[PDB]
Amino acid sequence: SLQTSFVTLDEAIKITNRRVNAIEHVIIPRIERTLAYIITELDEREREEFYRLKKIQEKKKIIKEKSEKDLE
Amino acid sequence: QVWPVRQVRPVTEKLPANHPLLTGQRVLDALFPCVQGGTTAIPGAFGCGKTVISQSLSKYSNSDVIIYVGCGERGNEMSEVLRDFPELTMEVDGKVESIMKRTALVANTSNMPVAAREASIYTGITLSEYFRDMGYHVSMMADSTSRWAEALREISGRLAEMPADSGYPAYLGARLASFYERAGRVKCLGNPEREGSVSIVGAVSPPGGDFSDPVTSATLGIVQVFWGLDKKLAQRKHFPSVNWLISYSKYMRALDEYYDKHFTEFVPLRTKAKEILQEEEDLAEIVQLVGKASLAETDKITLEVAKLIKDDFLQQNGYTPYDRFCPFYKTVGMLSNMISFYDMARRAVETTAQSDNKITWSIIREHMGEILYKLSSMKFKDPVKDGEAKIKADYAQLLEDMQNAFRSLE
Amino acid sequence: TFGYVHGVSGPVVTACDMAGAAMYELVRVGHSELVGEIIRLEGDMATIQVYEETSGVSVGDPVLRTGKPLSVELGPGIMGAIFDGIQRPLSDISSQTQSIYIPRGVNVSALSRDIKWEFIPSKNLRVGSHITGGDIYGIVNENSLIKHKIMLPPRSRGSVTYIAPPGNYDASDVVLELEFEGVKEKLSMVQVWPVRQVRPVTEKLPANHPLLTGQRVLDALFPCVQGGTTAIPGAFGCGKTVISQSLSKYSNSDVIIYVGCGERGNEMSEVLRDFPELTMEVDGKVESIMKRTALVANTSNMPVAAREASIYTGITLSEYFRDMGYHVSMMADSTSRWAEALREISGRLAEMPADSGYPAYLGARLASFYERAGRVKCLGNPEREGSVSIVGAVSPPGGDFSDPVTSATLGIVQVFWGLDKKLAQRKHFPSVNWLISYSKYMRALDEYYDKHFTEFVPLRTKAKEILQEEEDLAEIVQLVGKASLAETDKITLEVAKLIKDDFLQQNGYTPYDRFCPFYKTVGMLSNMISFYDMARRAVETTAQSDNKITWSIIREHMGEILYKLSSMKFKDPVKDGEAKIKADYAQLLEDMQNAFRSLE
Amino acid sequence: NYLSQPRLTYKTVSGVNGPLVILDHVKFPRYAEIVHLTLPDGTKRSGQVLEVSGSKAVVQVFEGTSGIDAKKTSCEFTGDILRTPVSEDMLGRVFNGSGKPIDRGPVVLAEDFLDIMGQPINPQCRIYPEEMIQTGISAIDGMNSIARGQKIPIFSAAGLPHNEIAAQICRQAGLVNFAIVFAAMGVNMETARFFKSDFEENGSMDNVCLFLNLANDPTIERIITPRLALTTAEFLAYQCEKHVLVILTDMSSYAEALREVSAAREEVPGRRGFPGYMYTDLATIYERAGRVEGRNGSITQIPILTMPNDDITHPIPDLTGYITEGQIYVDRQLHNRQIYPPINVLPSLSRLMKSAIGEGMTRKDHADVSNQLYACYAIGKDVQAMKAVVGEEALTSDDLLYLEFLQKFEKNFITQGPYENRTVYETLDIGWQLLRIFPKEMLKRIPQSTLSEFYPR
Amino acid sequence: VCLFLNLANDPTIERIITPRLALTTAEFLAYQCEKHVLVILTDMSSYAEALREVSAAREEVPGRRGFPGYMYTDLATIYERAGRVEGRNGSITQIPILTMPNDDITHPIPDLTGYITEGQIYVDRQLHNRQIYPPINVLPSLSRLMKSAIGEGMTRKDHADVSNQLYACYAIGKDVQAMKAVVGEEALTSDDLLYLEFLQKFEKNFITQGPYENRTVYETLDIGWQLLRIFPKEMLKRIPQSTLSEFYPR
Amino acid sequence: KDRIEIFPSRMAQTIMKARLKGAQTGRNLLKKKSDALTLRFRQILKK
Ligand SMILES: Nc1ncnc2c1ncn2[C@@H]1O[C@H](COP(=O)(O)OP(=O)(O)O)[C@@H](O)[C@H]1O
């Protein structure tokens, strides 16, 4: 009965440790790299939007300068 | 004659594309085939083979003429083309002749002025539409359509236009569309009838190696063939690095009417090859968290044949003479043997797992280890040294040898 | 002389009649004289980013251009001063105003005039003598510790036309006059230098001599050279105060500069409370460290430009003391707070973001700051070496070192002292993680150790190897239990435990460990590694024998040596001289030799 | 002939913003001409006209705009683009990032005033780089062989010994006339002293030139620094027909100078805020490599770059990886285990290698041996990743052989002393001493003829 | 039928008008000529790219991903030209075809469309890569009018119940398939193995058609029950016990 | 392969953080299961 328990525990430990290691070396690393990619591309959307809005504000400043010249 | 490059050269009609563009490469010709008149992209990270494929179509294809557009590509690309193409030869009418006699180069190497990239693309397609009107089946390589899109980005930036994504202009989709739509098979203009074509092959080079890139995204919505190159295969020097999960061709329904004539055995084999590879991925996602001991013996056979297909079919060395080119008769014969092993090995297990006399993958490997080695050896057969009858006879002998070995396990 | 305010929008003030202005010149804006830096010119108009709050600035207010960019008043009166990051004297603002606040638009001069200092002119000089930038034209005896070498500004040169006699002077009395190209310069003791301009030197020397901190892990395993660049992870649990206070109470440095880059208000005031009360021994006296430091302290709500200028002020002070031939050290209590201030400047200038929102130039601003560290031949004639050592702390969010300011800092600094909250939770002071930490300076300091400590190169190597082996062996201990290891591995783990418990830990709250000199440090390690080599020798020498040696035999027959090894940290340099400590350590070497000889 | 017309000097600085000084009333502004600025205190500075419009000229100032004054600044327009005073006598010398000397020698007496931008080498006249260089390093000369005139960068994480590898290439590089041009952008003096000292110590000085831009030198000079180096290399390699090796140190700091300029000019950003044109600008540096028709000389390049946050997908290594022929990679996953030089072959590749190997260059086995070393090393990493989940009990006897291969490969094939030189032939002998670990039939990348001639030897 | 053809080489700006011409023809045919028009719009992404091209040229303020801020109202003036009207027998059905960029269901083009249109029919890469034609993923698909278009006098009366139970079974099937991928097949219960077996049989028999298969609504629900009967009677939670008693024992 | 390829959005950022908490929890619980089974297994071996 110690031996039948022993062999069954030895299998159940290996199955459990394969799940723990699959989480530790596959599932968590896919998630952490996915999240690092997401945080990077979210900053890319933020800089794209910043650049567009900066050019819009510049174009509005140019329109104001043209209007001030047209008022001469 | 002088033609405005931005204006499409007219045609009597744009015919459906219905004949394969046979290339240098097994995976292309077999599993993701281009058609004469088809629009194709090769999106890939740096150092994947996008130019080796571009060169290999240009060196080895059934195209009558090639226009090779070095748009934004490295300088030594043009030197490698000018080194190889005068020395490399096709044969016509029993005469050996240099393939440079059928190629034109439109260089615009990465350091040459950024604006000339746009003019280079439109020059190469205008040359390609000119030989298309002669009835020649033209093929046009574009060595990076994203290095073109970057020139549109730069001029658009200097003009201070509003960008769409990553700084690219909003018209980038239409600029790419009105380039790839210049492909086709056509009833040419004018009196004598011709059936010329332009086939376009855009070696898209996505920034960071990421196919979410706007040039890749816009290109994928426009082409009908996608040979996505995976950097992880190229790192392993698994070449050509075409990822068989992501890649596709929309021309298969149009090409089935050609295969049913010239290669009636092939369409089942193409289907089984894709299925075996798909099953290997759907198995691998399990194995990676539990170990190979979890699998059924049919699934060990599926994994092992998917390794044969990966390492000996899909892989092809474009420099070594045995794999420098691979005609379709070699390609089908190799694949027929690898799938003949699969169907027999799978039948052997399924026939005997019902009984105490059960066959297993290890039983097959120990009785047939020489057959596995011979199956992998099939790539070394050389069409320069070995006649068609010799390669066909050797491949028929492997079919018979496998059949008699599996009959000896049952 | 002055322009006029033309427009205002938050911190940005546009001014007119600014035709004579210069880019990055510093301006007093409004009747309140708010500080502001010119960020743009557009003809007879300038755009000034006002540092202080502009609320109440009016169109047509005066705009007085100072002829200078942001600059530090260098001179006597620096030592023991506390400044904000734009070089305003916080102790004088309090004492002159009798207010708890910093008033908007303080005009107070940064080195206080009307104080008289004893000046001695350099006795060799005469009228008609030749003099060059960085020449010492006198000394000011401001403190017993620090004699301030008064010197010619780096760009100045000529023939002396006058020198002041020995006597008492304030910083604005003319001390020297000299002529060049028919033009006279009248020199004060105060010297004004642009804060973002490196102070020039005769040669940027290779750094070769150790900055002893008096800390075993630091001075032995991860030495920082004098003139070295280094970082510390400045976070809550890490115990960053231990290195800061140890450097203050013992370091081989002549002057210390601190920069608060925008610390939390209470944390800043904790530092400003503590340092007046810290002391060190000098010529057998005990004296307050404020005699040899200056504090560039900013809270998070100081003007953005004071936080961004904070490091540039601290390094410009440090380069000034370096040019006196003092071996300066300096700390920044978080360069991340400086990078947040730089991010905010960039956001107000409306510049493109780079990584994580920081400006494009963050990497070059950090690298050009750390490059101002070093050892040097100073300017001028008295052939004096000096140095600045820079200890810039980093604050990676959640401990993620990939964060751009942290990652760029770790890309530049040659030493990282990885303080770790896990060690502090174990009370393993000084809490330096020896796996994360590194130093690139070993290749230089190997010359000093070969001259003075010729046994140390083996010892340092063996110590790091033992610790790295124990980290691998601990996985085997988890897999199969400690009892299942080989005897060589067991004795390695036991010595690694001795190193971790009684070498790498140091009880800086107590007299025997308040500081730990290098002679003590090398001596302790020499014994621990001699014990390792002889113990492992006895094990391996008796491999395959009948009477096999093991750690348990050693602990049973000679456990007095382990007890003595752990006891060696308690020796005190203030009670017993280094020769007596070395002699006691030599007796433990003889005792363990006789003990090992008694077994094999 | 010489430009005889006298230079105009303008006080008409109508604005200053970031690094830009906007002159006005200018007579026929020449795009990209160089202006010499004199500040109020008489400090000389230099700058390039980056845009022109009517009377206006937008001068970017190299030494920065701090202290520029809209009334007292004087701008001398030289009437011509930026030129390098090149000569043979630049070998044995050291210059700062703007081409002024810093070795306390005189200014260069010019044999020619080459345009710093060069010109595009005509692709018909570009000779294909077929000849091999031995670098002396097995991780290169074996699996990543470099051709004479082939541009191939070292990519590294931060803090790795990539400078020591590039110094080792300068120390040991020779064919299977010679000179070096070294450039550095934003190098710390602790590293600048290392390269200058290594060349002086090896006695190489009579055949090397150094351009140094130190970490505290004005960031805009980084843009011209590798161009000065390449302009000197074009003189030496095409006018004097030397084999030149060009070393460009931290192209990362070059790319950071591009990011700074674009952020200040508000040019369109690509990935990570770098200029949308960054590939073209890097191509203007990297394509100035290779042999040319009727010249004996050649420009090899080994750029060097710290990959930010180790990210292979970052725009700097990515755009460099799309231009340069092949990349040599060095890795913390080797360096932390003390494996010097830390060259990770698996991500590495030399595009021009396929031509630089086999008969007349190297042993006939080399092309096959390289590909099988990649297969075994890669399968070793793959079975290592499996072992970290399932343990060595699930691995087959062959999977344990791929792990033993990985250990023997990193210990014998990669690891090599800083003064140890290995021939390509010795490297291939070591290649077979590792490939022989597997049974002959396992070597699925190698032809049966190559196995029959070399596997049992 | 009436075909308007703007091809991918034709000028981009015509595509701003193309769907509006089609809908104006559909309005004439349906509301003035009583026709039961069906409108197909072949690629609302190549439409939305034309609005982005003009808006960028007008220097307009971007909405998210550079599309015009008015993209919602503009697409509404396309998609709202649908439905029956008072007094008329005629009608306009619309089926806008729409190419999701990067396969992103939240991209502005499918996003603003999903807000305006009466659900979406979603065609999935992961079904197409497995040869399942048509690749319609029933899970992210929705029709907002399904609940009222079906029942006694309009279809068989079981229709709503069969479709609701099939949806829950396929959805649970996808979740137990995700369990098999993340934690292995051995983590599944006997009931989870039934939902996985249901998913395999369901994609094979329900979704798959071939391009000329034309199953009636009756044959569709018959195949529905021939799949639902795989589960034990108590597991069909979404179906009332009266409907089970008439159609489960079949 | 390296990533799950959910498309970058604030939604997907939150979903990935939720998956990370789920996975780290799953690791810690299954590691506790392994520790308890390992302790019983070592007890059984001694017995
Ligand atoms: N089919 C192939 N056979 C052999 N080597 C190949 C093959 N495809 C690619 N390679 C190797 O990969 C390298 C990089 O491929 P290449 O197309 O030149 O790069 P890129 O994709 O950047 O254009 C080639 O130089 C060659 O060494």
PDB file of N, CA, C and O in Angstrom, chain C residues 19-23 40-43 204-206 355 360 364 371 402 407 414 440-441 443, chain D residues 14-18 65-69 71 159 164 188-190 193 219 259-260 269 309:
ATOM      1  N   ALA C  19      15.229  92.229 -28.809  1.00  0.00           N
ATOM      2  CA  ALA C  19      16.067  92.059 -29.991  1.00  0.00           C
ATOM      3  C   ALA C  19      17.495  91.596 -29.662  1.00  0.00           C
ATOM      4  O   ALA C  19      18.053  90.775 -30.378  1.00  0.00           O
ATOM      5  N   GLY C  20      18.069  92.072 -28.556  1.00  0.00           N
ATOM      6  CA  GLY C  20      19.397  91.683 -28.073  1.00  0.00           C
ATOM      7  C   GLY C  20      19.474  90.361 -27.304  1.00  0.00           C
ATOM      8  O   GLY C  20      20.529  90.036 -26.770  1.00  0.00           O
ATOM      9  N   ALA C  21      18.378  89.625 -27.166  1.00  0.00           N
ATOM     10  CA  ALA C  21      18.335  88.402 -26.377  1.00  0.00           C
ATOM     11  C   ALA C  21      19.154  87.269 -26.990  1.00  0.00           C
ATOM     12  O   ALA C  21      19.493  87.314 -28.169  1.00  0.00           O
ATOM     13  N   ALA C  22      19.395  86.207 -26.227  1.00  0.00           N
ATOM     14  CA  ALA C  22      20.015  84.994 -26.729  1.00  0.00           C
ATOM     15  C   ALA C  22      19.240  83.731 -26.365  1.00  0.00           C
ATOM     16  O   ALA C  22      18.645  83.637 -25.301  1.00  0.00           O
ATOM     17  N   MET C  23      19.251  82.728 -27.231  1.00  0.00           N
ATOM     18  CA  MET C  23      18.621  81.434 -26.976  1.00  0.00           C
ATOM     19  C   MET C  23      19.147  80.823 -25.670  1.00  0.00           C
ATOM     20  O   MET C  23      20.353  80.830 -25.440  1.00  0.00           O
ATOM     21  N   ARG C  40      12.713  80.349 -27.435  1.00  0.00           N
ATOM     22  CA  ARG C  40      12.640  80.694 -28.857  1.00  0.00           C
ATOM     23  C   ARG C  40      12.906  82.168 -29.056  1.00  0.00           C
ATOM     24  O   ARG C  40      12.520  82.973 -28.220  1.00  0.00           O
ATOM     25  N   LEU C  41      13.438  82.540 -30.203  1.00  0.00           N
ATOM     26  CA  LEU C  41      13.484  83.913 -30.684  1.00  0.00           C
ATOM     27  C   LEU C  41      12.730  84.012 -32.001  1.00  0.00           C
ATOM     28  O   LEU C  41      12.766  83.078 -32.788  1.00  0.00           O
ATOM     29  N   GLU C  42      12.081  85.130 -32.276  1.00  0.00           N
ATOM     30  CA  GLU C  42      11.343  85.352 -33.527  1.00  0.00           C
ATOM     31  C   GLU C  42      11.529  86.792 -34.036  1.00  0.00           C
ATOM     32  O   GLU C  42      10.592  87.427 -34.508  1.00  0.00           O
ATOM     33  N   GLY C  43      12.733  87.341 -33.905  1.00  0.00           N
ATOM     34  CA  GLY C  43      13.064  88.710 -34.298  1.00  0.00           C
ATOM     35  C   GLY C  43      13.251  89.579 -33.066  1.00  0.00           C
ATOM     36  O   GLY C  43      13.955  89.194 -32.138  1.00  0.00           O
ATOM     37  N   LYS C 204      41.154  64.403 -19.246  1.00  0.00           N
ATOM     38  CA  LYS C 204      40.223  63.463 -18.612  1.00  0.00           C
ATOM     39  C   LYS C 204      40.894  62.111 -18.392  1.00  0.00           C
ATOM     40  O   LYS C 204      40.949  61.271 -19.286  1.00  0.00           O
ATOM     41  N   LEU C 205      41.456  61.915 -17.212  1.00  0.00           N
ATOM     42  CA  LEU C 205      42.298  60.772 -16.878  1.00  0.00           C
ATOM     43  C   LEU C 205      41.518  59.459 -16.790  1.00  0.00           C
ATOM     44  O   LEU C 205      40.327  59.473 -16.483  1.00  0.00           O
ATOM     45  N   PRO C 206      42.174  58.306 -16.996  1.00  0.00           N
ATOM     46  CA  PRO C 206      41.597  57.025 -16.631  1.00  0.00           C
ATOM     47  C   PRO C 206      41.390  56.954 -15.118  1.00  0.00           C
ATOM     48  O   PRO C 206      42.264  57.330 -14.343  1.00  0.00           O
ATOM     49  N   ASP C 355      10.351  56.926 -26.254  1.00  0.00           N
ATOM     50  CA  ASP C 355       9.928  55.773 -25.457  1.00  0.00           C
ATOM     51  C   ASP C 355       9.213  56.138 -24.149  1.00  0.00           C
ATOM     52  O   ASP C 355       9.633  57.040 -23.431  1.00  0.00           O
ATOM     53  N   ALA C 360      13.097  62.532 -26.942  1.00  0.00           N
ATOM     54  CA  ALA C 360      14.142  61.894 -27.734  1.00  0.00           C
ATOM     55  C   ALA C 360      15.527  61.994 -27.095  1.00  0.00           C
ATOM     56  O   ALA C 360      16.285  61.031 -27.088  1.00  0.00           O
ATOM     57  N   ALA C 364      20.844  60.967 -24.460  1.00  0.00           N
ATOM     58  CA  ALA C 364      21.972  61.890 -24.560  1.00  0.00           C
ATOM     59  C   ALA C 364      22.075  62.845 -23.373  1.00  0.00           C
ATOM     60  O   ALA C 364      23.180  63.212 -22.990  1.00  0.00           O
ATOM     61  N   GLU C 371      28.883  61.393 -18.290  1.00  0.00           N
ATOM     62  CA  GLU C 371      30.203  61.671 -18.857  1.00  0.00           C
ATOM     63  C   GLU C 371      30.934  62.799 -18.121  1.00  0.00           C
ATOM     64  O   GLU C 371      32.155  62.883 -18.188  1.00  0.00           O
ATOM     65  N   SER C 402      13.718  47.666 -17.460  1.00  0.00           N
ATOM     66  CA  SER C 402      13.575  48.017 -18.880  1.00  0.00           C
ATOM     67  C   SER C 402      12.993  49.424 -19.110  1.00  0.00           C
ATOM     68  O   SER C 402      13.061  49.946 -20.222  1.00  0.00           O
ATOM     69  N   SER C 407      16.862  51.957 -17.756  1.00  0.00           N
ATOM     70  CA  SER C 407      17.589  51.190 -18.750  1.00  0.00           C
ATOM     71  C   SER C 407      18.726  51.996 -19.367  1.00  0.00           C
ATOM     72  O   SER C 407      19.852  51.515 -19.430  1.00  0.00           O
ATOM     73  N   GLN C 414      28.881  52.385 -14.914  1.00  0.00           N
ATOM     74  CA  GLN C 414      29.800  51.262 -14.826  1.00  0.00           C
ATOM     75  C   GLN C 414      29.605  50.412 -13.576  1.00  0.00           C
ATOM     76  O   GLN C 414      30.160  49.323 -13.508  1.00  0.00           O
ATOM     77  N   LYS C 440      32.115  47.271 -13.591  1.00  0.00           N
ATOM     78  CA  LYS C 440      33.059  47.214 -14.717  1.00  0.00           C
ATOM     79  C   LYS C 440      34.471  47.697 -14.356  1.00  0.00           C
ATOM     80  O   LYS C 440      35.393  47.515 -15.142  1.00  0.00           O
ATOM     81  N   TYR C 441      34.677  48.303 -13.185  1.00  0.00           N
ATOM     82  CA  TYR C 441      35.947  48.959 -12.835  1.00  0.00           C
ATOM     83  C   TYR C 441      37.077  48.033 -12.385  1.00  0.00           C
ATOM     84  O   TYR C 441      38.195  48.508 -12.175  1.00  0.00           O
ATOM     85  N   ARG C 443      39.119  45.904 -13.848  1.00  0.00           N
ATOM     86  CA  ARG C 443      40.308  45.983 -14.715  1.00  0.00           C
ATOM     87  C   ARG C 443      41.233  47.167 -14.413  1.00  0.00           C
ATOM     88  O   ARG C 443      42.440  47.045 -14.592  1.00  0.00           O
TER      89      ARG C 443
ATOM     90  N   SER D  14      16.350  85.856 -38.176  1.00  0.00           N
ATOM     91  CA  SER D  14      14.964  86.248 -37.904  1.00  0.00           C
ATOM     92  C   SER D  14      14.275  85.379 -36.864  1.00  0.00           C
ATOM     93  O   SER D  14      13.184  85.709 -36.419  1.00  0.00           O
ATOM     94  N   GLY D  15      14.878  84.266 -36.467  1.00  0.00           N
ATOM     95  CA  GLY D  15      14.354  83.442 -35.396  1.00  0.00           C
ATOM     96  C   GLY D  15      15.308  82.329 -35.030  1.00  0.00           C
ATOM     97  O   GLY D  15      16.234  82.024 -35.772  1.00  0.00           O
ATOM     98  N   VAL D  16      15.087  81.729 -33.875  1.00  0.00           N
ATOM     99  CA  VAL D  16      15.820  80.574 -33.376  1.00  0.00           C
ATOM    100  C   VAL D  16      14.818  79.668 -32.709  1.00  0.00           C
ATOM    101  O   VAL D  16      14.042  80.157 -31.899  1.00  0.00           O
ATOM    102  N   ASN D  17      14.817  78.373 -32.979  1.00  0.00           N
ATOM    103  CA  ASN D  17      13.865  77.446 -32.373  1.00  0.00           C
ATOM    104  C   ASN D  17      14.455  76.039 -32.340  1.00  0.00           C
ATOM    105  O   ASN D  17      14.844  75.513 -33.376  1.00  0.00           O
ATOM    106  N   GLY D  18      14.575  75.423 -31.168  1.00  0.00           N
ATOM    107  CA  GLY D  18      15.348  74.188 -31.036  1.00  0.00           C
ATOM    108  C   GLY D  18      16.761  74.365 -31.605  1.00  0.00           C
ATOM    109  O   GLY D  18      17.383  75.393 -31.341  1.00  0.00           O
ATOM    110  N   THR D  65      22.213  75.677 -30.483  1.00  0.00           N
ATOM    111  CA  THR D  65      21.808  77.090 -30.577  1.00  0.00           C
ATOM    112  C   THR D  65      21.950  77.891 -29.293  1.00  0.00           C
ATOM    113  O   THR D  65      21.756  79.097 -29.336  1.00  0.00           O
ATOM    114  N   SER D  66      22.301  77.299 -28.154  1.00  0.00           N
ATOM    115  CA  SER D  66      22.477  78.040 -26.897  1.00  0.00           C
ATOM    116  C   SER D  66      23.399  79.243 -27.082  1.00  0.00           C
ATOM    117  O   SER D  66      24.515  79.072 -27.556  1.00  0.00           O
ATOM    118  N   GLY D  67      22.963  80.458 -26.767  1.00  0.00           N
ATOM    119  CA  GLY D  67      23.771  81.667 -26.968  1.00  0.00           C
ATOM    120  C   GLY D  67      23.640  82.347 -28.329  1.00  0.00           C
ATOM    121  O   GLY D  67      24.158  83.446 -28.485  1.00  0.00           O
ATOM    122  N   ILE D  68      22.938  81.769 -29.307  1.00  0.00           N
ATOM    123  CA  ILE D  68      22.623  82.462 -30.566  1.00  0.00           C
ATOM    124  C   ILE D  68      21.735  83.665 -30.264  1.00  0.00           C
ATOM    125  O   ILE D  68      20.820  83.569 -29.460  1.00  0.00           O
ATOM    126  N   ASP D  69      21.982  84.779 -30.932  1.00  0.00           N
ATOM    127  CA  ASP D  69      21.420  86.096 -30.655  1.00  0.00           C
ATOM    128  C   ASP D  69      20.909  86.721 -31.948  1.00  0.00           C
ATOM    129  O   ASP D  69      21.655  86.814 -32.920  1.00  0.00           O
ATOM    130  N   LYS D  71      20.563  89.631 -33.164  1.00  0.00           N
ATOM    131  CA  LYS D  71      21.144  90.915 -33.586  1.00  0.00           C
ATOM    132  C   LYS D  71      22.656  90.860 -33.748  1.00  0.00           C
ATOM    133  O   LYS D  71      23.187  91.486 -34.658  1.00  0.00           O
ATOM    134  N   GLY D 159      26.020  46.794 -22.299  1.00  0.00           N
ATOM    135  CA  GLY D 159      27.010  46.259 -21.357  1.00  0.00           C
ATOM    136  C   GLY D 159      27.790  45.023 -21.831  1.00  0.00           C
ATOM    137  O   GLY D 159      28.766  44.650 -21.185  1.00  0.00           O
ATOM    138  N   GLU D 164      35.081  44.926 -27.477  1.00  0.00           N
ATOM    139  CA  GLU D 164      36.223  44.019 -27.434  1.00  0.00           C
ATOM    140  C   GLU D 164      36.206  43.066 -28.625  1.00  0.00           C
ATOM    141  O   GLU D 164      37.253  42.818 -29.210  1.00  0.00           O
ATOM    142  N   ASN D 188      31.412  56.860 -24.578  1.00  0.00           N
ATOM    143  CA  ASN D 188      31.990  57.385 -23.337  1.00  0.00           C
ATOM    144  C   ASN D 188      33.514  57.363 -23.407  1.00  0.00           C
ATOM    145  O   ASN D 188      34.085  56.444 -23.989  1.00  0.00           O
ATOM    146  N   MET D 189      34.203  58.319 -22.790  1.00  0.00           N
ATOM    147  CA  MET D 189      35.661  58.404 -22.867  1.00  0.00           C
ATOM    148  C   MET D 189      36.345  57.128 -22.368  1.00  0.00           C
ATOM    149  O   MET D 189      37.326  56.701 -22.960  1.00  0.00           O
ATOM    150  N   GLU D 190      35.779  56.437 -21.375  1.00  0.00           N
ATOM    151  CA  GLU D 190      36.234  55.117 -20.895  1.00  0.00           C
ATOM    152  C   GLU D 190      36.319  54.055 -22.006  1.00  0.00           C
ATOM    153  O   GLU D 190      37.152  53.156 -21.943  1.00  0.00           O
ATOM    154  N   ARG D 193      39.045  55.820 -25.084  1.00  0.00           N
ATOM    155  CA  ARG D 193      40.395  55.486 -24.643  1.00  0.00           C
ATOM    156  C   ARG D 193      40.724  54.030 -24.906  1.00  0.00           C
ATOM    157  O   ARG D 193      41.841  53.754 -25.307  1.00  0.00           O
ATOM    158  N   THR D 219      25.333  66.639 -30.015  1.00  0.00           N
ATOM    159  CA  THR D 219      24.713  65.417 -30.531  1.00  0.00           C
ATOM    160  C   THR D 219      24.544  65.428 -32.037  1.00  0.00           C
ATOM    161  O   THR D 219      24.671  64.382 -32.659  1.00  0.00           O
ATOM    162  N   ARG D 259      16.521  60.678 -34.138  1.00  0.00           N
ATOM    163  CA  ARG D 259      15.296  60.853 -33.359  1.00  0.00           C
ATOM    164  C   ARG D 259      15.233  62.236 -32.733  1.00  0.00           C
ATOM    165  O   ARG D 259      14.195  62.879 -32.832  1.00  0.00           O
ATOM    166  N   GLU D 260      16.332  62.743 -32.181  1.00  0.00           N
ATOM    167  CA  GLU D 260      16.403  64.119 -31.687  1.00  0.00           C
ATOM    168  C   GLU D 260      16.082  65.139 -32.769  1.00  0.00           C
ATOM    169  O   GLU D 260      15.209  65.977 -32.563  1.00  0.00           O
ATOM    170  N   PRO D 269       7.049  60.670 -37.635  1.00  0.00           N
ATOM    171  CA  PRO D 269       7.634  59.525 -36.963  1.00  0.00           C
ATOM    172  C   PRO D 269       7.231  58.206 -37.614  1.00  0.00           C
ATOM    173  O   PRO D 269       6.061  57.980 -37.905  1.00  0.00           O
ATOM    174  N   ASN D 309      16.837  47.659 -24.981  1.00  0.00           N
ATOM    175  CA  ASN D 309      16.073  46.648 -24.239  1.00  0.00           C
ATOM    176  C   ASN D 309      16.165  45.226 -24.833  1.00  0.00           C
ATOM    177  O   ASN D 309      15.243  44.427 -24.683  1.00  0.00           O
TER     178      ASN D 309
END
